Design a protein around this ligand. Structure first.
Ligand code: CA
Lengths: 335, 324
């Protein structure tokens, strides 16, 4: 009621690419920009003044605290207390000169795993925050992390291209997926939890079988991959490119969609938990919300600087973004 | 060139009477609902275009400026013909074509309505005691022409006989706009006296009288019926049902003109604030907005709802192709 929808238009930006070289503008279905579970808009409700570029952001479950990863540390913010202007906690994880690149909360929300420009991954106990343990790898840096559905394993995208598989229980490296010839930049797990998908600076996206430990598919692109996400309801994989394109690949199938609403690198992306829509962030200061899988533009938010990272809450009610302007922004998704 | 929709949002601008309107699922999307209005032609009239009309079938556009109506062929950038007034200083305020398209009625700041034969020269002249004509309306049977006089009276002219048959008096100030209900038995008008009135095409006198704090500049009756949109000197647009109406706020200045799409599912309004706004019938969801270079004083929509033409303060008219 506070805000009302108003339709806009743009030159064709969403295309469907067939098996053969053939691009065609997508005819948006009746529920492309409106419908159950589809956001009407997003309202900025908080700004978290980290003071360093925020390369990683995560939100707690229940939603009350936001974790921002900057240089050397992760700051914890209590967003359930509007008046707060400073963090309630600060986790020193790496050298004050090294940047945090990824931080992930375990399914239960009692542990946080932090990785970045260093050979060690820190595991923090968030129970009534202290360093619980550390995972030391031979790779110089970690660019992204993923936690297995059963919370027993942590996958780490290494700067050397390898994907490390860590057994959290005994802090041991049980497996290593080799393939990427350049750093692995992003990762996600299929909805059935049997497959892993990674993106790399070697211009490839690779799928891996977790119960076997071998590469299944490989998609080669014209530019580097910086982000990706697997649709929670399956069938689709969204990929953010340095070329500025967002590619939504049809798992196993030929066809795909190509989305063009970023003028620069797509640094991060995340699917809503319902899978009906997703967001991408870019070096061009834009946060774009897209309908799954064809990419109808649901909403756009222009921030003050590059948007390097993002996360969405488990109930799809909040979006947090990390900024080149040394802060994080909290948005409430309005339906 | 292909275009695609992109959803946006704005602070509450549509109200039901003042409670924000809960836009239905088909408020901004649906068959017959525009997705984009593409500017395809600029008609350089040379004078402020206070009046515009489109032929049926769509082919020729007529723009009325100061002492001259120009004809443009949009089925193919300069005028294909033009109709000059005795005094090149007489500002034209309205021009309507008859169903066939071989006759154009021109009215304006003059004491005479000019009937032009487009099969071109003045076929006849209808002189009135009133100082000027601010708006014209043709009856469905195309045998009668209603003229809004600057004195407030509504002159009824028998086209074939070229004679004044009657008048509807009431407006303290000259009437500025008019339209006929979908049934064709009721007449609705608005005046510079800050009033909107309704008349009977049989009895001959006023029926309803509405209150407004500003001069009404435009009016439109929904083709499919049931609704009536009004534009005021203020900047508001209201869709009347009877009680229960809607109020729309997206103009920063006077609402100079308004026109319903023939399917009636949507309509447009123009303002001195350089905006062409498209609204969903009847609650007023914003379908699209176009910011022009100057004031938009007039508009028309083709009978096939495929084109919109606007008259501008920058001495030109703009042709838009409606993209569905
Ligand atoms: Ca681009």
């Amino acid at each position: 009621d506070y805000f009302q929808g108003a339709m806009g238009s743009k030159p064709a930006y969403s295309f469907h690419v067939t098996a053969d070289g053939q691009m065609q503008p997508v005819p948006f279905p009746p529920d492309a920009l409106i419908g159950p579970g589809i956001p009407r808009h997003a309202r900025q409700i908080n700004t978290l003044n980290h003071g360093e570029v925020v390369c990683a952001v995560t939100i707690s479950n229940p939603t009350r605290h936001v974790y921002t990863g900057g240089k050397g540390c992760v700051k914890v913010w209590d967003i359930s207390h509007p008046g707060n202007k400073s963090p309630v906690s600060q986790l020193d994880c790496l050298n004050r000169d090294n940047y945090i690149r990824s931080c992930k909360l375990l399914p239960d929300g009692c542990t946080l795993i932090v990785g970045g420009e260093a050979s060690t991954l820190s595991i923090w106990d968030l129970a009534a925050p202290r360093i619980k343990a550390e995972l030391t790898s031979s790779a110089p840096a970690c660019y992204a992390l993923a936690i297995s559905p059963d919370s027993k394993v942590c996958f780490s995208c290494c700067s050397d291209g390898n994907i490390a598989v860590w057994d959290l229980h005994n802090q041991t490296l049980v497996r290593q997926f080799q393939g990427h010839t350049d750093g692995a930049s992003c990762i996600d797990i299929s909805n059935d939890g049997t497959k892993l998908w990674t993106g790399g600076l070697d211009n490839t996206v690779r799928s891996w079988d977790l119960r076997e430990g071998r590469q299944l598919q490989q998609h080669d692109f014209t530019s580097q991959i910086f982000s990706l996400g697997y649709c929670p309801t399956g069938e689709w994989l969204a990929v953010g490119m340095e070329s500025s394109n967002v590619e939504v690949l049809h798992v196993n199938k030929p066809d795909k969609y190509q989305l063009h609403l970023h003028e620069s690198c797509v640094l991060s992306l995340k699917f809503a938990y319902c899978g009906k829509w997703f967001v991408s962030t870019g070096k061009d200061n834009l946060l774009n919300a897209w309908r799954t899988p064809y990419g109808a533009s649901i909403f756009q938010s222009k921030e003050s600087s590059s948007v390097l990272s993002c996360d969405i809450s488990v109930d799809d009610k909040y979006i947090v973004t990390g900024s080149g302007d040394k802060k994080a922004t909290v948005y409430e998704v309005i339906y």
